[PDB]
């Protein structure tokens, strides 16, 4: 099916404590493959998936060099936004950045994204046309103007449409045995009685990959549903519950790893 | 593969 490569960056100033914290994480689909923590000892970009450990010292030095440069730029960003918003040198602030590309089943470019947040609020985002920006406020418009004057969208689009897709296809190939695998959910039902006149039913979806799943109670939708959560082994979990004595009158599971959607009853 | 160009806000 469709795949994606995304990079998530967090920069947090610490005026008293020290230099800003910088965390960078790289994902292919729902699998993390690289990390950088400015507070870790290595000061290197680190592998987090077995298939990326195949890459040579040139990849790693280059990925290190780049992540350190992203770090330096975001340090400057922090001081720029403090300037833009007339903030004191004494408070902590957070800049988050996200960028990446989506491919289809054909492995052809589909969607590109490159956006920023400041203190938890949108700030700037590249539009779907990969040609124009969305500034969230009048401070964010100062960025837009300098990025329009400097032709940033065009260089960014060259990375999102070309470079990004090329490396995503490489990652998808080099790690085909993990990235290109559908783990079907191990579903089951649990019964617990809340009262002597009421009962609770829990539909479980376990050990599935990718994270996209739909659990529905047959359609009834007014039920307790939990956020899809990692199991920690590269697989995910989720459960859907519903609140008598006639608890035999069903839960529907739809996942990418299921040929025909499975239906559960007690 | 990180983007080699960085842009100042």
């Amino acid at each position, epitope marked *: 099916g469709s795949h994606s490569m995304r990079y998530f960056f967090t920069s947090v100033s610490r005026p008293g404590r020290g230099e800003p914290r910088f965390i960078a994480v790289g994902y292919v689909d729902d699998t993390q493959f690289v990390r950088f923590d400015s507070d870790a000892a290595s000061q290197r970009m680190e592998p987090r998936a077995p298939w990326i450990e195949q890459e040579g010292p040139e990849y790693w030095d280059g990925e290190t*060099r*780049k992540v350190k*440069a992203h770090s330096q730029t975001h340090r*400057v960003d922090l001081g720029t936004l403090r300037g833009y918003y007339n903030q004191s040198e004494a408070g902590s602030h957070t800049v988050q950045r996200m960028y990446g590309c989506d491919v289809g089943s054909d492995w052809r470019f589909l969607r590109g994204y490159h956006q920023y947040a400041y203190d938890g609020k949108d700030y700037i985002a590249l539009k779907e046309d990969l040609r124009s920006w969305t500034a969230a406020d009048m401070a964010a418009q100062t960025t837009k103007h*300098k990025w329009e004057a400097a032709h940033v969208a065009e*260089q960014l689009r060259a990375y999102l449409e070309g470079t990004c897709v090329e490396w995503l296809r490489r990652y998808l190939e080099n790690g085909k045995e993990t990235l290109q695998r559908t783990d079907a959910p191990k579903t089951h039902m649990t019964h617990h009685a809340v009262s002597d006149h009421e009962a609770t039913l829990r539909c479980w979806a376990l050990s599935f990959y990718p994270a996209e799943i739909t659990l529905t109670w047959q359609d009834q939708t007014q039920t307790e549903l939990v956020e899809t959560r990692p199991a920690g082994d590269g697989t995910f979990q989720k459960w859907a519950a519903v609140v008598s004595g006639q608890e035999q009158r069903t839960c529907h599971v739809q996942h990418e790893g299921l040929p025909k959607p499975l239906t559960l009853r007690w | 593969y990180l983007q*080699p*160009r*960085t842009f100042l806000l």
Partner: T-cell receptor, first 107, second 110 residues
Framework: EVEQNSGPLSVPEGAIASLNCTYSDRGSQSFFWYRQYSGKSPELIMFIYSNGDKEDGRFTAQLNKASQYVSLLIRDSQPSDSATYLCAVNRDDKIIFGKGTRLHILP | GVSQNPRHKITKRGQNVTFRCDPISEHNRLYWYRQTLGQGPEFLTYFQNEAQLEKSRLLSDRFSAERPKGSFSTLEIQRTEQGDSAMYLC?????????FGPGTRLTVTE
């Protein structure tokens, strides 16, 4: 970064002058053509950031990211064009220049 | 917009030189380049504000650049060799496109 330009080019006044250039890093995003007169410093004549052709008057720049190639074509060559042409390509957030091609516009 | 001083400089082999660069005002990125006849500008160093981020691996310990307040920059060659003879170009940039200065033509004489 290796950026490859070439040797002396003599083209008559009014003819088409064509400069070629290749860069070693497929990851590059920013491509320029700098012109440099004798005893002067480089000035930007064109930038190209997408595959395709960019036309600016008598100048046509071409970029091929898949074959890591950049050209510059000058239509109706004039004496003012006799300069060394420097192909410039980014290596992260710095421009790395080629050796330069000296172009002579002959009367 | 970019200024350089001195425009021409003659020094005796073994002396020390300092060239100054006054970049364009809103330009956060500053570069130093080296050029000889029939060659292109050779990358020496790069500043993003006051920080010197990248420095040429091939560049000697005799060459050291500074940009104190993230504005003007100085490049200094200590105990000059005759191979140091070249034009020293400074360039400023807001993003990637470079605006070169009028250079410093350095001649190192025996």
């Amino acid at each position: 970064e290796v950026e490859q330009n070439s040797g002396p080019l003599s083209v008559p006044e009014g003819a088409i002058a064509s400069l070629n250039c290749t860069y070693s890093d497929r990851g590059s995003q920013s491509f320029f053509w700098y012109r440099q007169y004798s005893g002067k410093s480089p000035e930007l004549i064109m930038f190209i950031y997408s595959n395709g052709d960019k036309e600016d008057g008598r100048f046509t720049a071409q970029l091929n990211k898949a074959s890591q190639y950049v050209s510059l074509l000058i239509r109706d060559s004039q004496p003012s064009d006799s300069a060394t042409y420097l192909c410039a390509v980014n290596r992260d957030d710095k421009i790395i220049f080629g050796k330069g091609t000296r172009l002579h516009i002959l009367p | 917009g970019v200024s350089q001083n001195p425009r021409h400089k003659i020094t005796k082999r073994g002396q020390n030189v300092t060239f100054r660069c006054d970049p364009i005002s809103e330009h956060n990125r500053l570069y130093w380049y080296r050029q000889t006849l029939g060659q292109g500008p050779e990358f020496l160093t790069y500043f993003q504000n006051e920080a010197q981020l990248e420095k040429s691996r091939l560049l000697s310990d005799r060459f050291s650049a500074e940009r104190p307040k993230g504005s003007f920059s100085t490049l200094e060659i200590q105990r000059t060799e005759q191979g140091d003879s070249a034009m020293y170009l400074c360039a400023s940039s807001p993003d990637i496109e470079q605006y070169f200065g009028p250079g410093t033509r350095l001649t190192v004489t025996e």
